[PDB]
Amino acid sequence: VKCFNCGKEGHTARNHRAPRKKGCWKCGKEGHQMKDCTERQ
Ligand SMILES: [Zn+2]
Ligand SMILES: [Zn+2]
Numbered sequence: 001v002k003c004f005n006c007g008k009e010g011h012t013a014r015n016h017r018a019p020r021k022k023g024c025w026k027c028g029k030e031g032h033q034m035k036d037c038t039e040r041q
Pocket of ligand 2: 024
């Protein structure tokens, strides 16, 4: 139930990640995620 410590069930109970999409949720890159991607923001 608790993902490592927070509590969300779909938050990977190991590193608390994978919130939405595997790429950058906007650029489609794997090197970085959605919080580490500018893409003309
Ligand atoms: Zn959580
Ligand atoms: Zn990106």
